[PDB]
Amino acid sequence: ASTVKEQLIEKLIEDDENSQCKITIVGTGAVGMACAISILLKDLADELALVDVAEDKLKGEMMDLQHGSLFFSTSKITSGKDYSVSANSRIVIVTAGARQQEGETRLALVQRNVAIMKSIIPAIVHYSPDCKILVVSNPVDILTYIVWKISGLPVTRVIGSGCNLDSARFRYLIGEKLGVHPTSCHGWIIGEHGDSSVPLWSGVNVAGVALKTLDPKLGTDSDKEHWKNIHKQVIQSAYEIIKLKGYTSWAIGLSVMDLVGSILKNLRRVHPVSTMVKGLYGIKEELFLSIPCVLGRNGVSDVVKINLNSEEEALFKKSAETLWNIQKDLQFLEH
Amino acid sequence: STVKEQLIEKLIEDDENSQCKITIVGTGAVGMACAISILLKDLADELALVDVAEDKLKGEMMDLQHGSLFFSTSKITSGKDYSVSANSRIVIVTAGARQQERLALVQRNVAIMKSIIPAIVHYSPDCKILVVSNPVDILTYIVWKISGLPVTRVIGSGCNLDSARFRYLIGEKLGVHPTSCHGWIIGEHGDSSVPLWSGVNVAGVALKTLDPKLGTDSDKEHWKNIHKQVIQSAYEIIKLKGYTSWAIGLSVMDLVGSILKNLRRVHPVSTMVKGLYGIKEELFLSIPCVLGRNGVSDVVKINLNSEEEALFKKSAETLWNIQKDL
Amino acid sequence: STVKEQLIEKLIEDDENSQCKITIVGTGAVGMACAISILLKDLADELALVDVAEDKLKGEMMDLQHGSLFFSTSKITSGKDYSVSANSRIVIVTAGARQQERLALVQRNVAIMKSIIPAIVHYSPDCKILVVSNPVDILTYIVWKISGLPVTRVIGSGCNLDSARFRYLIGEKLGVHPTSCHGWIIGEHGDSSVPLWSGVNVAGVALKTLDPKLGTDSDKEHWKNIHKQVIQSAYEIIKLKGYTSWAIGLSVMDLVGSILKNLRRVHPVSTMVKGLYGIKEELFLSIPCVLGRNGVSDVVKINLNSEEEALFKKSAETLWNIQKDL
Amino acid sequence: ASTVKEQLIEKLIEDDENSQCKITIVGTGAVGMACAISILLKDLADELALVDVAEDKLKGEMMDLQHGSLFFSTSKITSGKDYSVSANSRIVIVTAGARQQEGETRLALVQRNVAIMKSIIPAIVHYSPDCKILVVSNPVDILTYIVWKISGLPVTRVIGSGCNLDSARFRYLIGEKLGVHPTSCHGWIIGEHGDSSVPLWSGVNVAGVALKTLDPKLGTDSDKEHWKNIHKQVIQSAYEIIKLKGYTSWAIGLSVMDLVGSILKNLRRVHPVSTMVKGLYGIKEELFLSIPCVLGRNGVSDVVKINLNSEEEALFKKSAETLWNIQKDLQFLEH
Ligand SMILES: NC(=O)c1ccc[n+]([C@@H]2O[C@H](COP(=O)([O-])OP(=O)(O)OC[C@H]3O[C@@H](n4cnc5c(N)ncnc54)[C@H](O)[C@@H]3O)[C@@H](O)[C@H]2O)c1
Ligand SMILES: NC(=O)c1ccc[n+]([C@@H]2O[C@H](COP(=O)([O-])OP(=O)(O)OC[C@H]3O[C@@H](n4cnc5c(N)ncnc54)[C@H](O)[C@@H]3O)[C@@H](O)[C@H]2O)c1
Ligand SMILES: NC(=O)c1ccc[n+]([C@@H]2O[C@H](COP(=O)([O-])OP(=O)(O)OC[C@H]3O[C@@H](n4cnc5c(N)ncnc54)[C@H](O)[C@@H]3O)[C@@H](O)[C@H]2O)c1
Ligand SMILES: NC(=O)c1ccc[n+]([C@@H]2O[C@H](COP(=O)([O-])OP(=O)(O)OC[C@H]3O[C@@H](n4cnc5c(N)ncnc54)[C@H](O)[C@@H]3O)[C@@H](O)[C@H]2O)c1
Numbered sequence A, D: 001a002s003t004v005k006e007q008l009i010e011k012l013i014e015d016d017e018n019s020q021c022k023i024t025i026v027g028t029g030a031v032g033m034a035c036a037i038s039i040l041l042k043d044l045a046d047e048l049a050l051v052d053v054a055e056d057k058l059k060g061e062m063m064d065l066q067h068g069s070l071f072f073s074t075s076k077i078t079s080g081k082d083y084s085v086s087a088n089s090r091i092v093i094v095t096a097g098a099r100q101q102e103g104e105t106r107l108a109l110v111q112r113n114v115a116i117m118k119s120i121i122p123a124i125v126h127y128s129p130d131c132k133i134l135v136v137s138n139p140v141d142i143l144t145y146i147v148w149k150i151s152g153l154p155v156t157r158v159i160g161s162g163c164n165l166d167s168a169r170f171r172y173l174i175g176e177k178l179g180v181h182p183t184s185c186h187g188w189i190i191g192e193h194g195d196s197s198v199p200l201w202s203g204v205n206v207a208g209v210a211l212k213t214l215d216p217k218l219g220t221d222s223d224k225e226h227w228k229n230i231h232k233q234v235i236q237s238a239y240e241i242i243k244l245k246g247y248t249s250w251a252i253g254l255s256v257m258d259l260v261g262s263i264l265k266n267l268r269r270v271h272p273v274s275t276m277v278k279g280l281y282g283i284k285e286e287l288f289l290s291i292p293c294v295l296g297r298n299g300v301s302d303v304v305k306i307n308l309n310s311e312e313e314a315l316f317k318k319s320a321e322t323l324w325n326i327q328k329d330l331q332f333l334e335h
Numbered sequence B, C: 001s002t003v004k005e006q007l008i009e010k011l012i013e014d015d016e017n018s019q020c021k022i023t024i025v026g027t028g029a030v031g032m033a034c035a036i037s038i039l040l041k042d043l044a045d046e047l048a049l050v051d052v053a054e055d056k057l058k059g060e061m062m063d064l065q066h067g068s069l070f071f072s073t074s075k076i077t078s079g080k081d082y083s084v085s086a087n088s089r090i091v092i093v094t095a096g097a098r099q100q101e102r103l104a105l106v107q108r109n110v111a112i113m114k115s116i117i118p119a120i121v122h123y124s125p126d127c128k129i130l131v132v133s134n135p136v137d138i139l140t141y142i143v144w145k146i147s148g149l150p151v152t153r154v155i156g157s158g159c160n161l162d163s164a165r166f167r168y169l170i171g172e173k174l175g176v177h178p179t180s181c182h183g184w185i186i187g188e189h190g191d192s193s194v195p196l197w198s199g200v201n202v203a204g205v206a207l208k209t210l211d212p213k214l215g216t217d218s219d220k221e222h223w224k225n226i227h228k229q230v231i232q233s234a235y236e237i238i239k240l241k242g243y244t245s246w247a248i249g250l251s252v253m254d255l256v257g258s259i260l261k262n263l264r265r266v267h268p269v270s271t272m273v274k275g276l277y278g279i280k281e282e283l284f285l286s287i288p289c290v291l292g293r294n295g296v297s298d299v300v301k302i303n304l305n306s307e308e309e310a311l312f313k314k315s316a317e318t319l320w321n322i323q324k325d326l
């Protein structure tokens, strides 16, 4: 009855601070905050927690987000170097690490980001046992495997951002060619995210009309329309953005926001994300690559068995062998 | 081997543990107004509908499900048995007969609460119950005593809608969006609602500061008719259209959002006010409460002035004497 | 001096040039289902309602305006005179009697179009007209000839809703969200709709690839009953609830979004198909069109197979012979 | 009948490329793209055009946004150094320039950003004559004046982002103190954006309850609750974010997104933005400061006459004199 808060507000219950739709982002770099602002403007999280080892930059990014509290609906934004703020997250998004491509890349950086996951995954899983881990850092297909091993979590709950973006890039350029919104051009990229992704031209379609129906040479070099160069631009428009601005952040953030929605809302949408493919498309080793997956509140609940044709399945398996030896290429350093 | 078997390899058994479920009880005008508003704001992972009119309930539910491709709610269910309402975070009660705040009809809707509230709480023990049916301040009290739940988790839609009307009419008079015109209606949802001209303001400027007879009959601008309209707009609508659906659906959707997202926003909703403004009995009336994931976590203590407190305490007793008649 | 005069200094005269206005004609079940769906997706700066039922029209409009504080549309207006519909970018026609695709009732709704479409186009010369009333493929043609507008700017809601049902039922059978199950219904909105099992697919996998008798009576899985349901779901709903409102409102809101935001998405909507699939006369039927800020800017040329083309051309003639009867 | 597009799509009309809700952002730095991603995830624009003089960074930021096309609804994203892409914008957002505070700041940077506006405003106004210009670059109250003079546009159509963010910061910290969502704490900052802003404690309230009603010493030093230090933190939490992360981007972007919504949707909401205040609160010179303004499709249609008390009006007028001489401090360099 002396202070303003006491005079104006009668507390009836002690407020809960155990959110029930909570998101932690680990790594508040370009990709991390792109994820953050996108998750915030779509109101996909009750509480958003941020983790990083740059204690100063982490505190600054969090305050900047907080000062926008009036303009979105996430009611609690927190941060800290100790993973206790991670506690009881529905989804933990891992964005930490150096910037690099996949497949053909220097092991020093591949191993550096592997070291980062060894540091964080044990804690992340301790404080959020029932969470799904959504791996974004690159090489994404390899770190998702690494995380899954360290975490000891079910394979269904450890997911790589994979080719969700690749397919979005794919659908954007198809749309430009045809003059149609990407939401209406349908086309799938699978396998490795980045340099050696596999386009499945058999399925590229509009309104159910296979495009290779209209152009039997779609995706071959013989094609006089040069549709295959779309796939090469899918791959290299990424490289080009890095050249021109130095990194990629905006589209991946939207891609993560796409996946986070499907998981939390339990939509059971199909997305090309990285899951473990042993026992699928003739794969007999334990490795992670992108295939079409049904995504729900429990992570990957089902997967789609696209019947790959001989050319597609060959590249898929080649890429699978690539990652396999690189997964083997970290084990031999961790003697 | 089926298409599904050949197309889709099951990896885990999909859960029916909806982490953000909502049930609406009574799929009438107000019920499905709430339903569609909740659906287009993606505030629920699962939406369950319950009614005694089996045929209407199934038609409503199917009509909603056919629109699944245009919203994000993944599961819509219906049923006369309250098992389908299990594990809702919020149950919105809109069942009843169209009414106001004669007693034959008040008991008619009290009969309904006595038969639904037990099964509702049984299947969703941690839920919040948002009472919309009228008399809302009465039935919220009835529902609370039936449920045996904490007082902070039974909430009447109350004067959220009253205040939304109050601000719309203040906005038209001033030429400003209702969001930027602030004003409060508390007490009864209905004919004895209490306007707080004390705090009616734009940009922090108390309006009565600029016209000190604001809200009196003396007033030359006659702002007190905006309150008369707050009350008579509802009656007018009911004469012209037959009922009220859209605004109250929106008001419910507003409250549901503060609760589920635990925003801790202040809304004028019906809670039990024993201990405030010299209220000595157990009755529910709208006052400014802080809404979060547990319902009312805090209430605001507005120091009602000479005349405001009078009608609030009158508004209060009107109800208390309607309640005691069993 | 008033509160407004003392509070607010006018700097310019506020314009009534709504740059994103929408009119709904016919504030019935379907009319106001469209209305609330448009309002909660913030697709219109101004929403205008027109009807012959003055009293209902004013009650509906007021009930919407009282919710102004919960959505972003700044102005809601009504009126029996079509002047209030002036300068809409889209006019959605939902007026008429509940019907199907007897002729006494078809002429009944044609009587309506003849009396509204002239005033509509007069006041909104650059608008798109989205026809929802049934028979939709018929009335879209009627409206087009009355309006004198380009064919690309008169559009029937058509089989957007049909296809949304098609995908919902394919999704329940497979356990996948309707957005990820792709399938197309074209031709008549109603009983003679044509399913294109050719292109029904998930993740690009043609479903008939996995079960080559997909969509036949021979089929052991009996997928052809999902199409029967697409048609009979509507009838079922009408028997149980009395009418259909929510899904079609959502489908209209989907189309309105592609148009206003000029997204160039492909929807199966009713356009005039003279020249395609050997259609020789002027009739409207649903096929995949690209929707943008001018309505239909492009149409997709699906090479209908042996049997599909047959029923589409049959579906087509059914209508042409209903039209010629004045 | 040979190519896929010809075979699959029959063009009936030539597609329009004259958007009718278009936004140009000038300056694709931290603030510019924060604005961009926020405008995109709220679907406030049919078309979004980007302008900058860093041709490479501009091209990269635009492609990155484009690759997310599948996840939002803005159907055309464009960029270019030539202001023809600005053409027929409803709103042009100016985010270009060096980073600096207001009032007490080095003239070399104030003049540098003044030079930038001289370069762009003539073109911007040539290609979008009926547009509103929303000025974000700092010092914001001075550049908004500068822009308005150069543009020759009506005063109602040239708006500074001003204290919309300041008030959001203000409402966020009030909310923390009281444990209430900022949307429900109401409190206004006006005048200079940044170092010398004026808090109006007379109006700070919850549910219509003035807080100084409950604490007559609210906002004085004598206050045992030290509510005034909230205002000092409003001011210096900005400084602190710059120290910790190097700049501010996220909250201002959300603040601009707030204002863009009110303008395009013609909401007629009241926001504290910078308009020209000559003839208001005793001001007799031509200068720009933030007061509560009604914002609609035509810019500032009305303004609110808060009756400032003697202490408030004194600081408002002092700050007004500050900007006045600095507006005079650029004229004497532009001999
Ligand atoms: N999957 C995709 O499609 C995709 C797309 C773009 C980028 N990425 C990638 O993911 C990463 C992010 O790129 P950025 O541009 O955001 O990087 P960035 O340099 O901007 O910073 C990311 C953060 O990682 C943090 N970090 C390092 N060790 C940590 C630890 N032990 N705990 C917590 N945080 C730690 C750093 O402090 C740093 O702030 C890169 O590997 C990049 O290649 C992937
Ligand atoms: N608080 C407010 O601001 C506000 C505003 C408007 C209306 N309302 C009111 O709330 C209610 C809704 O009115 P309506 O317009 O929806 O009426 P309505 O007749 O259209 O439908 C209400 C439904 O309740 C159902 N019902 C009755 N007993 C039931 C039971 N035991 N279990 C399940 N369902 C049952 C009926 O089958 C009916 O469909 C009325 O009491 C009305 O006065 C309140
Ligand atoms: N295309 C589809 O997918 C689809 C789906 C469902 C229903 N519909 C249909 O569209 C219409 C809507 O049905 P409802 O359920 O809305 O019926 P309803 O009776 O509830 O209301 C329709 C309104 O039209 C009005 N009206 C009649 N003549 C008018 C005129 N000259 N000017 C203005 N208003 C006029 C009436 O006053 C009435 O309120 C029906 O024809 C129905 O069959 C189409
Ligand atoms: N009003 C507020 O509340 C507020 C808040 C934060 C920052 N800001 C400010 O606004 C600016 C943006 O800060 P940043 O962090 O985004 O800067 P930044 O360094 O990230 O880059 C902004 C862009 O300005 C561009 N530019 C320079 N000359 C140009 C010209 N002639 N035409 C087009 N573009 C040109 C540059 O190329 C640069 O990319 C700074 O002045 C900063 O202080 C204001």
Ligand SMILES: CCNC(=O)C(=O)O
Binding pocket: A099, A100, A101, A138, A165, A194, A238, A239, A248, A252
């Ligand atoms: C740097 C690795 N990431 C990419 O190449 C991408 O943006 O897809």
Ligand SMILES: CCNC(=O)C(=O)O
Binding pocket: B098, B099, B100, B134, B161, B190, B234, B235, B244, B248
């Ligand atoms: C049934 C009574 N309802 C009302 O008065 C209202 O809609 O506010």
Ligand SMILES: CCNC(=O)C(=O)O
Binding pocket: C098, C099, C100, C134, C161, C190, C234, C235, C244, C248
């Ligand atoms: C009035 C007929 N309507 C329908 O069949 C439908 O709703 O699809």
Ligand SMILES: CCNC(=O)C(=O)O
Binding pocket: D099, D100, D101, D138, D165, D194, D238, D239, D248, D252
């Ligand atoms: C650098 C100038 N801008 C600020 O201080 C702010 O973020 O308000």
